Design a protein around this motif. Structure first.
Motif, PDB file in Angstrom:
ATOM      1  N   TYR A  99      -5.467  -4.955  -0.758  1.00 46.64           N
ATOM      2  CA  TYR A  99      -5.675  -5.984  -1.776  1.00 46.64           C
ATOM      3  C   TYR A  99      -4.397  -6.393  -2.498  1.00 46.64           C
ATOM      4  O   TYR A  99      -3.427  -5.640  -2.540  1.00 46.64           O
ATOM      5  N   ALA A 113     -11.543  -5.344   1.976  1.00 48.63           N
ATOM      6  CA  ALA A 113     -10.370  -6.107   1.533  1.00 48.63           C
ATOM      7  C   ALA A 113     -10.609  -7.520   0.985  1.00 48.63           C
ATOM      8  O   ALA A 113     -11.585  -8.186   1.334  1.00 48.63           O
ATOM      9  N   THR A 114      -9.691  -7.961   0.124  1.00 48.23           N
ATOM     10  CA  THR A 114      -9.623  -9.354  -0.301  1.00 48.23           C
ATOM     11  C   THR A 114      -8.916 -10.127   0.806  1.00 48.23           C
ATOM     12  O   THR A 114      -7.750  -9.865   1.102  1.00 48.23           O
ATOM     13  N   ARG A 138      -5.046 -10.600   1.561  1.00 53.42           N
ATOM     14  CA  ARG A 138      -4.157  -9.595   2.142  1.00 53.42           C
ATOM     15  C   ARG A 138      -4.719  -9.084   3.463  1.00 53.42           C
ATOM     16  O   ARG A 138      -3.995  -8.526   4.287  1.00 53.42           O
TER      17      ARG A 138
END
Length: 201
Positions: free
Chosen positions: A99, A120-121, A124
């Motif tokens: 992230y 994860a975001t 990234r």
């Protein structure tokens, strides 16, 4: 049907004890039956506490953790918190994070060590992907949490970039208190006749 009332791993029903978790939400109680066998689903519950275990479980319960060195992730997850739980209810499986708000290098280090699942975001998530740092050609389970807080926060075209990089025999689960168009596309392009479930009050 308490957790036990299902086909579940004992030490998991115990890690849960090490936690103190006893009985599933309406949404969890619906998903797991279908979720514990691979059936594609969709989930719709108000925003906040309650969602996690509908999928966390069908995952750990599906996979045989390995000690293999620097292994690919058999599972995947997305947001725009979720480590505390899964790591505790899936002690046998290795879990890590990714992230914005820390160093590439950082989450470009424990990666090469080995992996049993991810979260994860998408911002990234593609980073390590492009870098070739993250290999994603062995996933069995796929997850989208809050496909509206993604849309909103703006992580929607990586969501599917990362997504376009997983097996087709793979499985898919989607959760969104409000199921928006991009999550309607994300649903046609990525899921096999899923089963919707709605618990909104």
């Amino acid at each position: 049907m308490e957790f036990k009332d299902f086909p579940l791993k004992p030490e998991i029903l115990e890690a849960l004890h090490g936690r103190g978790l006893t009985t599933p939400t309406p949404i969890e109680a619906a998903a797991l039956p279908l979720a514990l066998e691979g059936k594609d689903l969709i989930g719709q519950a108000r925003t906040g506490t309650g969602k996690t275990l509908a999928f966390a479980l069908p995952i750990a319960e599906r996979l045989a953790p390995s000690q293999e060195r620097g292994r690919k992730p058999r599972a995947l997850v997305l947001t725009p918190q979720v480590a505390s739980e899964l790591t505790a209810v899936a002690p046998h499986l290795k879990v890590v994070a990714v992230y914005g708000g820390t160093g590439y290098g950082k989450q470009k280090e424990a990666l090469l060590r080995g992996a049993d699942a991810v979260v994860a975001t998408p911002g990234r998530a593609l980073d390590y992907l492009r870098q070739g740092v993250l290999d994603l050609s062995r996933v069995e389970v796929a997850v989208l949490d809050e496909a509206d807080e993604m849309l909103s926060m703006g992580f929607e075209e990586e969501v599917e970039a990362l997504l376009s990089a997983t097996p087709p025999s793979r499985q898919t689960l989607l959760f969104s208190a409000t199921l928006p168009s991009w999550a309607k596309r994300l649903a046609e392009r990525y899921m096999k006749n899923p089963v919707l479930i709605n618990v909104i009050k």
